[PDB]
Structure formats: C-alpha cells, structure tokens
Amino acid sequence: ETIYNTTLKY
C-alpha cells in the first residue's frame, strides 16, 4: 500500500 499525508486531524 502507498502511504499518504493526513490532511484532516481526528
């Protein structure tokens, strides 16, 4: 799987 940046915090 490719890993991406989170753009919306929980």
Epitope: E1, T2, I3, Y4, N5, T6, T7, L8, K9, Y10
Partner: antibody
Framework: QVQLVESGGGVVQPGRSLRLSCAAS????????MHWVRQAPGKRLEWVAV????????HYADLVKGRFTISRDNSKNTLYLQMNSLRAEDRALYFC??????????????????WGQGTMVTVSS | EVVLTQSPATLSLSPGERATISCRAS??????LTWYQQKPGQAPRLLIY???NRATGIPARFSGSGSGTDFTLTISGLEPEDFAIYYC??????????FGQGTRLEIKR
C-alpha cells in the same frame, strides 16, 4: 484488487429513507477510512461523508447533515449510509470508496483511491 | 467550500495527440490536488495525487503540474482507453472534499 459492492439503492418517496450497504473485500477494511460520494445525472462528483477506520470520527457534507449517517460494521466488512428524509435533489448514483492510509494515523488522508460500482437512488412521489 | 473549476468542458482529440486540462481552485489547497478518470456510470480511477505524483500502475504519459489554485493535467500520446471524463479533486481544505465539474475527452472527427 479491492472490491466494493454496493446495494440498498432504489426508488423511494420524498420524506422516506434508505440504507445503503457497501461490501468490501480485497484489502484490510478495518485499516482504512471510508467515503460516500454521489453523482447526480449529468452532474459532477459530490462528496457525501467520511468515517474513520474504527468508525470513531465522522464528517458530512452540509446538504445531508442531520439526515444521513455513515457507519461501518468491521466484523462484516460493510460500510453503510443511512439516508433519512430523502429529497428529490438526493437523486444520484452513490459510490462508496476507501481512502489511502496515513503515515501517523493522526487523521484522514482524503485520498480516495478505490471506488465501488455505485448504487442508484431515485426520490420521487 | 473550495470550488474547483475545470477547462475546457470538452476536448476533441484523436489517438497520439496531447491533452491539456486545467483545474482552478477558488482558494489554496496547496499541492493537495488529485486527478481522476471516469467513464459515465463507472467507478472513478485514481491517476495522480499531490498534483504531480502518479498513482500505482499509472503510465508515464499521464503527468500533472501546478499548485495552490492553478493545476494542469497532461496526457501525451493519447491511447483509446484515455477517452473518458477527467475530474480534479482537492483534499487540502476539507471538509467538504470537492471535485471539478469534469472535462470530457471525445474522439475527434
């Protein structure tokens, strides 16, 4: 090959409800955030809602707020979209989709990578 | 919301040619811009993310550029499978996640 199979769509009356289901396989369901996106006939893609991998955080598009509820049953690898108080403008092809993984799991990626085939919803009297 | 507007609405090209599609945003999304490919009534396919990164399995003829509010998708050496609808999506300022109105690549004649 990720597989997302939708069902539960159909024809409904204004004010009534539907609950869409999206069966997932071909990936680790419990690790990915999931989305619902809709597309009205001849119109553009409109984001509907998102839910975290563990179903603990949710966000909705203003238009469906208080009416739609996104949820998931990880044991069953199923994502749902409860659609209450349906309106004519809710008519559209509804897609469920997964988003890519984040590196630190501090939030969503918003990277919608794999989509289902969609299920149609028609609201009319 | 961040409104995405694509141009042109329809591009008439034939195999082998180069497609240039633009996507503009009402306000900055940094480089968090995604490009999708879709055929009517079918599942969209991820092509490029973060404006210029090609997704797994996506061929080199697909490239992207731009940042903030002005982006460009380029498809060189067009092949039959490329004639479809293309949508841009932003994940830089959400919710809500937003998409462009799409650009259709039709067969020229």
């Amino acid at each position: 090959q990720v597989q997302l199979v939708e069902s539960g769509g159909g024809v409904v009356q204004p004010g009534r409800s539907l609950r869409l289901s999206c069966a997932a396989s071909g990936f680790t369901f419990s690790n990915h955030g999931m989305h619902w996106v809709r597309q009205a006939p001849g119109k553009r893609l409109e984001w509907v809602a998102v839910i975290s991998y563990d179903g603990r955080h949710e966000h909705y598009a203003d238009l469906v707020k208080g009416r739609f509820t996104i949820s998931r049953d990880n044991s069953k690898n199923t994502l749902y979209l409860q659609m209450n108080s349906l309106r004519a403008e809710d008519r559209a092809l509804y897609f469920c989709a997964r988003e890519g993984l984040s590196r630190d799991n501090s939030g969503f990626t918003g990277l919608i990578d794999y989509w289902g085939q969609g299920t149609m919803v028609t609201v009319s009297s | 919301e961040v409104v995405l507007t694509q141009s042109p609405a329809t591009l008439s090209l034939s195999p082998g040619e180069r497609a240039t599609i633009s996507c503009r945003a009402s306000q900055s999304v940094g480089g968090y811009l995604t490009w999708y490919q879709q055929k009517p009534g079918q599942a969209p396919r991820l092509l490029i993310y973060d404006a210029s990164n090609r997704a797994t399995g996506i061929p080199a003829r697909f490239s992207g550029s731009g940042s903030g509010t002005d982006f460009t998708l380029t498809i060189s050496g067009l092949e039959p499978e490329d004639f479809a609808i293309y949508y841009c999506q932003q994940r830089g300022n959400w919710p809500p996640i937003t998409f462009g109105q799409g650009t259709r690549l039709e067969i020229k004649r």
